[PDB]
Design a protein around this nucleic acid. Sequence first.
RNA 1: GCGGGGAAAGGAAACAUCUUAGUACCCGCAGGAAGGGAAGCCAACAGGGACCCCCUGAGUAGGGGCGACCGAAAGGGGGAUAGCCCAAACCAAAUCCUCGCGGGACAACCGUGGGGAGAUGUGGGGCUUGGGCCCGGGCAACCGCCGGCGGGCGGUAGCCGAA
RNA 2: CUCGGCUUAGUUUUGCCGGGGGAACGCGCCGGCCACUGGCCGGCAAGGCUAAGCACGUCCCGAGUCCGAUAGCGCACUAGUA
RNA 3: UCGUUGCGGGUCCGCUUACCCGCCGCAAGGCGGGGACAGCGGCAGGCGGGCUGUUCGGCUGGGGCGGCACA
RNA 4: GGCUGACUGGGCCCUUGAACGCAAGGGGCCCAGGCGGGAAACCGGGGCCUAGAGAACGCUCGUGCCCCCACCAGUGGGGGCC
Lengths: 145, 155, 184
Amino acid sequence: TIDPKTFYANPLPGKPFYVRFEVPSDVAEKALEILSIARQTGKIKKGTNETTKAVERGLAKLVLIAEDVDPPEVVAHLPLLCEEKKVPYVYVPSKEKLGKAAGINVAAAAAVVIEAGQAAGELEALVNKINEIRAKHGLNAIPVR
Amino acid sequence: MIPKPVVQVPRSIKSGGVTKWKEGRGFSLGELKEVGLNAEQARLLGLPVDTRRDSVWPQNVEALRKWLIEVLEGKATPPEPTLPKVVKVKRKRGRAFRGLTSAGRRSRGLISTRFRETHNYKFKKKAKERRLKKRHEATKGLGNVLRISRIINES
Amino acid sequence: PSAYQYMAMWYRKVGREVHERLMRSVLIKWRKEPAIVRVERPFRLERARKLGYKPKQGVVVARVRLIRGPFNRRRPDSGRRPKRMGVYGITAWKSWRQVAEERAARKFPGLEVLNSYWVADDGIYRYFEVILIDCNQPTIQRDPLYSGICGREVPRRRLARRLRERQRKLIEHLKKTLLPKLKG
RNA sequence: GCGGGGAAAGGAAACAUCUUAGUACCCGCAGGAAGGGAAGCCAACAGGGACCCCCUGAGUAGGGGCGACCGAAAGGGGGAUAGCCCAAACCAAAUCCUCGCGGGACAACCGUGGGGAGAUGUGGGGCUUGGGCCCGGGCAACCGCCGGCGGGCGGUAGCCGAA
RNA sequence: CUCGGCUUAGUUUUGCCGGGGGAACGCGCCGGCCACUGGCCGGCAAGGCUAAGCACGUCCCGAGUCCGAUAGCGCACUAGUA
RNA sequence: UCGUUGCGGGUCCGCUUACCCGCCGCAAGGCGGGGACAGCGGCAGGCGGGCUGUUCGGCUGGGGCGGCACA
RNA sequence: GGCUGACUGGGCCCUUGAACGCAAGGGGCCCAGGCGGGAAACCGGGGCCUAGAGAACGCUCGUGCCCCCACCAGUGGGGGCC
Ligand SMILES: [Mg+2]
Ligand SMILES: [Mg+2]
Ligand SMILES: [Mg+2]
Ligand SMILES: [Mg+2]
Ligand SMILES: [Mg+2]
Ligand SMILES: [Mg+2]
Ligand SMILES: [Mg+2]
Ligand SMILES: [Mg+2]
Ligand SMILES: [Mg+2]
Ligand SMILES: [Mg+2]
Ligand SMILES: [Mg+2]
Ligand SMILES: [Mg+2]
Ligand SMILES: [Mg+2]
Ligand SMILES: [Mg+2]
Ligand SMILES: [Mg+2]
Ligand SMILES: [Mg+2]
Ligand SMILES: [Mg+2]
Ligand SMILES: [Mg+2]
Ligand SMILES: [Mg+2]
Ligand SMILES: [Mg+2]
Ligand SMILES: [Mg+2]
Ligand SMILES: [Mg+2]
């Protein structure tokens, strides 16, 4: 429902077109660590198809999207879906590091946290920080789930 | 003797209501359900099975019941099953060059029309007819010769 | 709905304008690279997966750039009747997709073309992606789809024995479970 | 045999549309055959039921300076008979390749360890008698891999054969 | 869908190539000899494979109202040779 | 004329990244100029013996000119 | 002086075309419909007679409560006979 031509109307310099806001390195590393605690204690999914299925089904709490997907159209739909479903999402620089935090031997373009076992408070703080960054970038806030 | 399915020849408007019977491709799923088998069981028994057909003919049902009774009572030996007994797949060399990919098939017209109606088929068919001097190609201008002769002899 | 269904939207009306904005920048660098280039991943993943792409060893995706328009029809330099002297508008019965498939097959000798798909156009060039398979790779030989290209044999003794055993067991079962119902 | 490029002479009692002819010829690509093949079919309210090839439909419909001339298909009779898979839905690395060692008809495969592919999805599942999904019951389960052991037959030299 | 072209029996109706425009989604889409509307009927394109039954003759075997050294293959022979 | 053809500002002005032109550079890329014009593909009109195919009838005090005694 | 027969639908015959095949065109004799002139008879299907004349395909017009267009009906359109 969210129109892509208006959502991606202002691409940021030096980034793929699907990246809406700049995520600092400390926030990206923080989100990677929350994905790590979710994998060891709660529940996560890794891979674009599984993450899209989670976001559609409504079981997603936080989505992580890589900024180094070579064909960007592989993951370009995920931010639009996250905005339509009101799920917070954050960008991470390396799909290789995203896959390592997800626990697989290969890179992952996207990942999602279904349940954050020992990382609920950290996830809330991260969501608030991404919400403030979206506020600076002009997009509306996406409340935690 | 393994029975052969009997089906109705399609009654065309040209025929005017004259109907006849012919040997069908296989027994229908309704006819097989009438005797208690599916397509897999029938093909294992060696019957010809036509899962596409919708008709159910009582003569087919009676023949199936009789032959299956002989088979189950051991007075008849069923043939080998009507399933593929060999799998021979050849390595394909130069499919793109011989036009066997999807683009080649589309350009040859097999996506839209039948193989018999494609233009290359027409070319090969007429070439073979002219080479062998077959049915109509044994004489050139046969239709015009017939037309003029009919005019002269029926005036 | 899978992720590939959403991936397809960039080649639909809803995502066309943003995809066209992306292509206006990607095509600048594509116009400078060689005519045929092996790529790590297909540009249209869902289309490639439909056409039979998998990320296995021995599967090659090649981007091919060629010039559009009708083929280079030649004006005859010898005597012809007037119907046979035309140039403009006469085209070949081959398409540029098949031309791109043949060119990629020439570049990768011994590999077999599986399929190909259009990717983009500019004023002069058309871009295709051709999927090719190495039939000598063990990872390709046993694939159920790629075996149709690379060959496959089954000894007739295996199929005949299994079918005969199945038929024997089926008659034995039907003797119990169907004969009284048939006869009654 | 398959894909592509592709004439003219002659005929039309001249000749250009046309035909010759998608031929001659050229370029490229396979197999012992190739191509085709499993209904977004044909029919007409009655029904056929993948495909190829043969006989016919038929020089009929139709195309055409409606001239020369060109020219089906459905249907019927035969040869033969065979049906399946990839992707997706759903699960999410349960997967595949290679190599070392031990076992295992010299095989498949099994255990183990290293490497490679693989979340941009390996694998499972699915193929019109649509499927996925949920529930219940039953094996005649189903589907694949190897071609070891034994036997028979035939071929690639020959032997016997009446008066 | 539209324009140009080659082809086709395909004719306001065959297939395809090129230029330009360009869908929907199973409550959908496609076909039923001009187009549209309604009914009825038949199906599910734009992915891959598939034995048998059919072409051919370097070659092997058999036959012949075939020719019989100017005939018959150009060559019955140190013939595709001089 | 359709497309390539994009970005601003009020049919017009501007811009550069498209595209084109030249220089340096192995390449990577850099410099300068032009610039959504040009060039290029499709379609359409004009000029077009540059090139291709053809036709240039008959009667006839021989053919030709003439005439039509060609209806 | 009065009119439009330079008429509608058809047939047969003569000539072009000798005896002896063979277009178009032209003329004659009529039947039916409905007319004009005339008291009536009778005449009128152009010009007192013998010259002024054109196939196929295509297009156009006139005509019919007309026929057909692909499973059925309708609408627009197309074709058909004279
Ligand atoms: Mg003929
Ligand atoms: Mg000629
Ligand atoms: Mg000749
Ligand atoms: Mg001639
Ligand atoms: Mg001549
Ligand atoms: Mg074959
Ligand atoms: Mg084959
Ligand atoms: Mg022909
Ligand atoms: Mg898979
Ligand atoms: Mg002896
Ligand atoms: Mg002699
Ligand atoms: Mg001799
Ligand atoms: Mg311009
Ligand atoms: Mg131009
Ligand atoms: Mg000249
Ligand atoms: Mg002349
Ligand atoms: Mg003369
Ligand atoms: Mg003269
Ligand atoms: Mg005359
Ligand atoms: Mg005469
Ligand atoms: Mg006259
Ligand atoms: Mg019909």
